[PDB]
Amino acid sequence: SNSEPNVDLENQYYNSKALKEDDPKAALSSFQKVLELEGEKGEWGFKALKQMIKINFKLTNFPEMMNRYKQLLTYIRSAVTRNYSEKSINSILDYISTSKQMDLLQEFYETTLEALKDAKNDRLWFKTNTKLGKLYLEREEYGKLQKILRQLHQSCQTDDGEDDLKKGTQLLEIYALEIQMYTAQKNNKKLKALYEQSLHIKSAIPHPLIMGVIRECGGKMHLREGEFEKAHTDFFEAFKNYDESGSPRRTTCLKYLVLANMLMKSGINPFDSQEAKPYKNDPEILAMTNLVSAYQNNDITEFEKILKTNHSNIMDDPFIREHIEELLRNIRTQVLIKLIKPYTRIHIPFISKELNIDVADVESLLVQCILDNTIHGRIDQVNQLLELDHQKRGGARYTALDKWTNQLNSLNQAVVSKLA
């Protein structure tokens, strides 16, 4: 293909790049002279301005550093496409972040914000605003976070509508910010409103972390309401996104997924595949692995022993503390049903001793099971007894015969009376 960009500009740019490791006073002068060579715009002088800002930040020269950063901001909306300029300005912002003069940092940030507003750098702009919002959430700031969210929403507003069809990614980032915020304020109603609006309008390309956060919030909301399948699916997608990304929230999301998969009954395992030699043997996940192993084996005694042994990491989460009662009820119900499947007419105290629980709890569980039609049996409370209907007759054909007999014979009687 090839294209002659320029020879002398690159040559002097590389000469100054070599000079950068020498005394900075000469490197800055050479870089400033690279901008004088072309004069109009920059191209290689665009990178020369970035190098000048870096070297000036080395020798604490800020005023002209910010003036030349304004020059670069004007250069972003210039013959240099807004493609590598975003990486260059992200690097400049990171270099400025090295020091601790927060006043200078925020002056830089506000100048960048206004320049990007003027340059209508839509994608770059809400990327910068989303980064600022993430920084605010990391410092638990909402005074300017709310303003940023309102501005981004207004930019997403299609006048009549509050949402575009391709700014779905914009609204996705906005809702991720608001999900972090309402996780800070644990506002369930706003959480569900955000999740609904996200599910509806967010349909677009996500960043894996954003999708994971939104799915984590959705699973939290669903398991707060009661939906086990939806919560399991949301935790599934969030944990897949965390696996892709690498955020520390991966372990917590996996624990939440383990809790969700145990609550959907029907005997499924969440530690089977992804929790392998790397993750199954993880010290923070080995407790959950053992829990679900007992759940598979229906070992109520071992399950309760593990619950009591690792209570500092089993029920430590208030949500898992809430759900542990339901999990115990479910596992006890499963063990009871499995125990009473092979036979009939079994005493209650034996079941209580087997389940290592009180007799009243066993009676309540039996009543609940019979109400759910899971047990084809009935309870004799006087003698502390559970009598099951063995129904070994397997008939009910005589019932059909009797119905056939009476209906047609009455049919015959009606016909004879009418015909006579």
Next chain:
Amino acid sequence: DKIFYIGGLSVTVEIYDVNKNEWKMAANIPAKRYSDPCVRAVVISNSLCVFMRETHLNERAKYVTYQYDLELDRWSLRQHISERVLWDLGRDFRCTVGKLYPSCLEESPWKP
């Protein structure tokens, strides 16, 4: 450029700024205990002040206004309304700031 939400059920002083968009506490108004103050916040003479009345058990109501400072967070004693000129107002009364003409209006007769 600041909104001063005073009272509620009390002596809650929660200051909000439009340019900052945040709610903060300043102080508590000095009021006698075992009482239910009736707070009234209004701008007077380009200066933030309050008009509050305290009522106790088997006690008469007292009317007094205080001068509040922004950076001091204290309600300095500006003027105490003597009962010889102003009598009891009530509970559902409202307060507002405006300019009036003494000649057109008439003084309200009441025994001190």
